[PDB]
Amino acid sequence: NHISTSDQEKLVQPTPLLLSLLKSAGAQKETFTMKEVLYHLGQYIMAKQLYDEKQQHIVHCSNDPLGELFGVQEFSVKEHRRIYAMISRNLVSANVKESSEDIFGNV
Known about the structure:
Blueprint: E1 12-14, H1 16-24, H2 34-48, E2 58-59, H3 65-70, E3 75-76, H4 80-88, E4 91-94
């Protein structure tokens, strides 16, 4: 937690839908880096309990904010390629590491 000042990776902004999932998954801010995004999202499933007893790597929940987001009522977590894609397209605004000065009306 104590590094210096600039040591944060570029974080993206999840869609208002995915956002809430993070919001309830322990996320607070509106933007999050893929790691954090993929982190709260994974917890969002276990918490809501979208996984099947049979297969633990299976997530099929017809009534779920996540399902309505990805646009499917069933998906396996074995093919990260598929998920990694849909989750990436669920980002409204993308933030990058650049010089962004704040305006506090103080001069």
